């Protein structure tokens, strides 16, 4: 996909992360587990929900009464109605089908962007204190216990505290 993360350098999704769309998996001497990124997940939910609601709510609906009220010597007028009806059907059918195709592409690429952006936020905190493995994971050059792991997830990782043990 467009941003290279989902089904890209991050090769697959996690069945084990049940409480959010995007997040983290850690492994250290104390254990391992998944933690959702609450903020990015909620923003994404709001974003996609807004898109769907706009597609729905921007439609202007008005009362119409559609019947067949012309007689056997009014076939030319009845044909005028046919062309109009068929014309609007063709317009709405094409526009609805393409809208769905195009917006589905946008939605999937939006998730991909969201994951890439989360990845990069971590990358720039860790910098030289961890190895970038190329698969979505970072391998620490120092011990990173649970409190350390949480500091990375909450964006307060203290690089100067660990640089010595990393080198």
């Amino acid at each position: 996909g467009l941003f290279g993360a989902i089904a890209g350098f991050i090769e697959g999704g996690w069945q084990g992360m049940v409480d959010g769309w995007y997040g983290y998996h850690h492994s250290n001497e104390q254990g391992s587990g998944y933690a959702a990124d609450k903020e990015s997940t909620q923003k994404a939910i709001d974003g996609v929900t807004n898109k769907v609601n706009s597609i729905i709510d921007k439609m202007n609906t008005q009362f119409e009464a559609v019947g067949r009220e012309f007689n056997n010597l009014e076939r030319r007028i009845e044909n005028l109605n046919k062309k109009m009806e068929d014309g609007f059907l063709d317009v709405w059918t094409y526009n609805a089908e393409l809208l769905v195709l195009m917006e589905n592409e946008r939605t999937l690429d939006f998730h991909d962007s969201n994951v890439k952006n989360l990845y990069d936020k971590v990358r720039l905190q860790l910098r030289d204190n961890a190895k970038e493995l190329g698969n979505g994971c970072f391998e620490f050059y120092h011990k990173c216990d649970n409190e350390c792991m949480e500091s990375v997830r909450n964006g307060t990782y203290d690089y100067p505290q660990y640089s010595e043990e990393a080198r």
Binding site: I6, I10, V66, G67, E85
Partner: protein, 324 residues
């Protein structure tokens, strides 16, 4: 073994697929269809005024009082009219209804409707008013006629020239109906009406009509080569309608007070009333939906989604999810 932190995304057991512009059949964690495909299979009120459901009668048979129709039950307002595709009971006596489609359109949605007597059947002192019957219009095994108009014939070998007025003293428009009989030949003409050369003149403040019977050798329809031709007007409050005739006159007895606000149309459907309410009615059922599109039926009445030729419009909500 060195410690690791990884970035990743949600997966689940969903097998739901969507299409994108660049790729078909993409499995995702969650999706949502925006195409309405369901209806309740019933004919319902519309916002929420009941329709007029004519069962096995046409609008014309209903208005004129075709005796083969069900007895007239007062429905003082409705939102749309439902006819069957081919109502069995239309014009029992063969013939025609002038400007019939425009009249049906006018009556499609009505805010007030009330049948009233405007010319008592008993008031025809100089003409015969109880012999205007036909085997084509039976009621209970006996020849009869449209119940709301009167087929007048001669009395004592005399048909005096009729001069009749009705003044709309009501506060509402009045739908008035009358007709002319077209006999088979001059011998029949004089048999029924005495006078060989006849007319029906009808005048209001806007109407200036003069009908004359056309003789033609016509095919028997239900045993009859004769024809009835019906006409109508909207008589405004304080206006008067004036009839004059020396034969062939199918006179009004009853007319209808009407109040007209909006219009709708005539729905063709074989369904019966379903004691329900809706914003959008189709001939095979009503739609209750805030979705933008539907694929049920084009002949809708109400505030409906946009009609499309599609089996599904599925939006991705969640993420790319490994398929099964």
């Amino acid at each position: 073994d060195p410690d690791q932190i990884c970035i990743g995304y949600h997966a689940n057991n969903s097998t739901e697929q969507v299409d994108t512009i660049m790729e078909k059949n993409v499995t995702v964690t969650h999706a949502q269809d925006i195409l309405e495909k369901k209806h309740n299979g019933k004919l319902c009120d519309l916002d929420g005024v009941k329709p007029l459901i004519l069962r096995d009668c046409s609008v014309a048979g209903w208005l004129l009082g075709n005796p083969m129709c069900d007895e007239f039950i007062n429905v003082p307002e409705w939102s749309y009219i439902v006819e069957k595709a081919n109502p069995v009971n239309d014009l029992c006596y063969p013939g025609d209804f002038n400007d019939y489609e425009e009249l049906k359109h006018l009556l499609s949605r009505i805010n007030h409707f009330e049948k009233i007597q405007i010319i008592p059947k008993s008031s025809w002192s100089s003409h015969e008013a109880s012999l205007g019957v036909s085997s084509a219009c039976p009621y209970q095994g006996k020849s009869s006629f449209f119940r709301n108009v009167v087929w007048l014939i001669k009395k004592d070998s005399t048909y005096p020239t009729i001069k009749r007025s009705y003044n709309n003293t009501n506060q509402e428009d009045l739908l008035v109906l009358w007709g002319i009989h077209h006999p088979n030949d001059a011998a029949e003409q004089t048999k029924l009406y005495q006078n060989p050369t006849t007319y029906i003149s009808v005048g209001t403040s806007t109407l200036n009509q003069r009908l004359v019977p056309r003789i033609a050798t016509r095919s028997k329809v239900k045993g009859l080569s004769g024809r009835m031709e019906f006409f109508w007007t909207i008589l405004k409050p304080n206006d008067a309608i004036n009839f004059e005739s020396n034969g062939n006159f199918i006179a009004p007895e009853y007319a209808y007070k009407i109040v007209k606000k909006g219009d709708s149309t005539i729905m063709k459907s074989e369904l019966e009333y379903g004691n329900c309410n809706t914003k959008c009615q189709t001939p095979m059922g009503a739609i209750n939906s805030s979705m933008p599109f539907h694929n049920i039926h084009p002949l809708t009445i109400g505030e409906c989604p946009k009609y499309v030729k599609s089996n599904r419009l599925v939006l991705a909500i969640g993420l790319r999810n490994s398929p099964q």
